[PDB]
Amino acid sequence: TGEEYIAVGDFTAQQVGDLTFKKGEILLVIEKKPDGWWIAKDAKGNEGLVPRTYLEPYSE
């Protein structure tokens, strides 16, 4: 149900859809960059809109 990257940027959600992650945490990704965003998940349970741009793959 997605692949996991970690964010390496500190983004917050300003609109609905997006999530709030920090510069070096682990996220999951679910959908591919239509316009820049994928639908990701965090280590809380929720899922948002995070870009790929500041996402790096992880070593599970």
Q: Domains of the chain (ranges plus CATH)?
A: 1-60 (2.30.30.40)
Instruction: Report, in angstroms and rounded to the nearest whole number, the Rg of the chain calculated over CA atoms.
Output: 10
CA distance 14 to 32: 21
Phi/psi at 29 (5° precision): -130, 135
- Confirm if 49 and 37 have CB atoms less than 8 A apart: yes
Residue with tokens 């999951």: 28
Q: What is the 3-state secondary structure (H, E, C) of 1-60?
A: CCEEEEECCCECCCCCCCCCECCCEEEEECCCCCCCEEEEECCCCCEEEEECCCEEECCC
**From which experimental method does this structure derive?**
NMR
